[PDB]
């Protein structure tokens, strides 16, 4: 099998497109999948040096972060639950001051390995504030390449057919980080792809588990949190669960890590579990997207069952348009298709 030979270790791959390769987003995503990048659950794409989404970020000090969250973390021994305390609205200027203040700034460190140890040692102390989930873009209007606010993928069929906007999913979110702000282990809503561009500032570090091993992570998590498992069918979707790399190693869960620098894109793939943290004051922009290969994942995504506010996209339009043979079978509950996580298209 040809797909199984490509990226056989399911390691996170990094790509450096030329400007010509970079122009067609859906085409380039298809290309990186032809190289087996999706097997990692995460890939880095470094755009051409001549490409820029914005002239300068010197005009954003007055941008409002309406719902900053203070991240209270509880736990020990590589297993943590993160609780989100919402604080009052603040401006980017008010946030950056806090971020760089003696109290909240990045500790001194030699190599990333040292900073990673400090993260895992200190994450339950000095709860940081994350300027997360801010509706908006920092891309200039004319930018046609990899524009997070208009990628033109088949995810556009949701709004097209129903008028439905789902904030952060088919619209962009901004994330202003400071040292030790975290994103818990999760896959995307409806097991979609995501794109994450780090506009400026200190790095954002990522952990990823191959989609091929996602079920093994779930089994571990359900074992570490039996109470949460009984309460909800997909408790990781609460995005509250933090698990250290040492804990993953101890239980033989394959994973990889990568550090995203300012100017770089991360792509997450359907059913690719990821988690991470910010190094210091930074700003990221992200949204979800889809490809034809997502459709089966969307059909089989296991959704949070204890909240009537979680994200649920109707699959009907995608199955009708892109799987006409199987529509009647699926509607009658008899579509037993098995996902091969290695395969492209």
């Amino acid at each position: 099998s040809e797909s199984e030979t490509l990226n056989p270790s399911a390691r996170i791959m990094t790509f450096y497109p030329t400007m010509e390769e970079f122009r067609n987003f859906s085409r380039y995503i298809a290309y990186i999948e032809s190289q087996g990048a999706h097997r990692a659950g995460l890939a880095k794409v470094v755009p051409p040096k001549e490409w820029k989404p914005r002239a300068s970020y010197d005009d954003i000090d007055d941008l409002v972060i309406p719902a900053p969250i203070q991240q209270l973390v509880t736990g020990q021994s590589g297993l943590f639950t993160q609780y989100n305390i919402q604080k009052k609205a603040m401006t980017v200027r008010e946030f950056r001051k806090i971020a760089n203040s003696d109290k909240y700034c990045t500790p001194r460190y030699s190599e990333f390995e040292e900073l990673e140890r400090k993260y895992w040692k200190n994450l339950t102390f000095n709860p940081p504030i994350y300027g997360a989930d801010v509706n908006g873009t920092l891309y200039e209007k004319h930018v046609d390449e990899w524009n997070i606010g208009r990628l033109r993928t088949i995810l556009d069929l949701v709004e097209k057919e129903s008028g439905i906007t789902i904030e952060g999913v088919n619209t962009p979110y901004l994330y202003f980080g400071m040292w030790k702000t975290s994103f818990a282990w999760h896959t995307e809503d409806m097991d979609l792809y995501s794109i994450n561009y780090l506009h400026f500032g200190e790095p954002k570090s990522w952990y990823s588990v191959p989609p091929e091993h996602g079920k093994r992570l779930e089994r571990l998590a359900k074992g570490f949190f039996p109470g949460s498992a009984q309460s909800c069918e997909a408790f990781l979707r609460h995005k509250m669960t933090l698990i250290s790399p040492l804990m993953l190693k101890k239980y033989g869960i394959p994973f990889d890590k990568v550090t995203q620098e300012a100017g770089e894109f991360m792509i997450t793939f359907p059913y690719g579990y990821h988690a991470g943290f910010n190094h210091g004051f930074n700003c990221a922009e992200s949204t979800n997207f889809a490809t034809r290969r997502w459709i089966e994942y969307g059909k089989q995504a296991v959704l949070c069952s204890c909240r009537k506010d979680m994200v649920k996209i109707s699959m009907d339009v995608f199955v009708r348009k892109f799987q006409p043979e199987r529509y009647k079978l699926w509607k009658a509950g008899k579509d037993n298709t098995v996902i091969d996580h290695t395969l492209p298209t």
Binding site: D133, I166, G168, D309
Partner: peptide
Amino acid sequence: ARKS
């Protein structure tokens, strides 16, 4: 409804 929205991503969080």
